[PDB]
Amino acid sequence: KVYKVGDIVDIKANMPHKFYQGKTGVVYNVTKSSVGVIINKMVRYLEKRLNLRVEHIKHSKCRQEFLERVKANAAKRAEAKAVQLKRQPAQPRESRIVSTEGNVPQTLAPVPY
Amino acid sequence: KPLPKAKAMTKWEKFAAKKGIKPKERAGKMIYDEASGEWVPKWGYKGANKKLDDQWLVEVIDPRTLNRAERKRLVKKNEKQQRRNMKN
């Protein structure tokens, strides 16, 4: 894959020589042998100019959700113009009746056998 | 043929005699590579000196190319010293 400056990639390793696996950064430089990634670190936040080979780097899908939500909201607004687009946390479940006719409650007897 | 007893200090033996630098024991190639469960001798096969090239992050132009250039410069300096000593 042709990585480009400013892209967001995930530092995934395939012994260690360091412990930066699972951290995400933005590409600042690219060359044939390796791709340059900058990772922010606290001392105020400092920065590290990491350089890694393409073998241990992959694109990050973190911004996919943002773009998808933006497009969906735009489409919904356009359709409704003919709105409550805000995301909502999982609301508590409402009351519902349960029927034991098809399933008799069994005392599992934690023995269990 | 004449005796092959040619002599030359190479400019190193003179200093080693002037200073108290005893000759190295010349133990062997094996050297412990910390942070790993392998010895990976200093030189001779899969040397640790080549580890910097095979490792994955080189924090602080590719620095691996810089290290290779430094190795080439050191080798060329050694060759130039050998040529200078041969000139004598």
Neighbours of A50 (CB within 10 A): 23
CB A53 within 8 A of CB A34: yes
Chain centre distance of CA A58: 13
- Please report residues of B whose CB lies closer than 8 A to that of A52: 56-58
B61 to A17: CB separation less than 8 angstroms, yes or no: no
CB B56 within 8 A of CB A33: no
At B46 the three-state DSSP class reads coil
Distance, in Å, from the CA atom of A10 to the CA atom of A12, rounded to the nearest integer, reads: 6
* CA nearest to A11, candidates A43, A63, A55, A66: A55
- Please report residues of B whose CB lies closer than 8 A to that of A51: 57-59, 62-63
Q: How far is A82 from chain B (nearest CA, A)?
A: 54
Experimental method: cryo-EM
Which residues are paired to B20 by β-bridges?
none
CB A11 within 8 A of CB A37: yes
CB B23 within 8 A of CB B13: no
CB B54 within 8 A of CB A52: no
The angle formed by the CA atoms of residues B11, B16 and B19, to the nearest 5 degrees, is 125
| B23-43 per-residue burial string, b: 16 or more CB within 10 A, e: under 16 | eeeeeeeeeeeeeeeeebbee
Through-space distance between the first and last CA atoms of chain A, rounded to whole angstroms? 57
Q: How far is A9 from chain B (nearest CA, A)?
A: 14
A49 to B58: CB separation less than 8 angstroms, yes or no: no
> Resolution of the deposited coordinates, in angstroms?
3.4
Tokens (6 digits) for A95: 């009351």
